[PDB]
Amino acid sequence: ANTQANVADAKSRIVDVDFAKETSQMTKNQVLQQTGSAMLAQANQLPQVALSLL
Amino acid sequence: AITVNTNVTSLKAQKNLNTSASDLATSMERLSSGLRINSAKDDAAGLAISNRLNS
Question: How many CA atoms lie within 13 A of B29 on its CB side?
Fold first, then answer.
């Protein structure tokens, strides 16, 4: 029983996820998605300077 | 003089407009990426310092 407890602890250190870290990464990538979407939508409007010159 | 064959004001306006467009594209890239240094064009010593800190 002792050894089972210690070995399950050891395995958990390797296999399981950390919620405190992974939620932070998720929120960071959410914000980056919104920023990149805005920036790409603004980037697709660059060829319209030619209509002004034309 | 009143000339038709050469227009210098247009040449200078073209160069200013090109400079402005280049600056805007650079800013757009930096906001899309989230990083100040995207190449070694930007900051060369900071690139190496940051590679070591990343290691």
Answer: 11
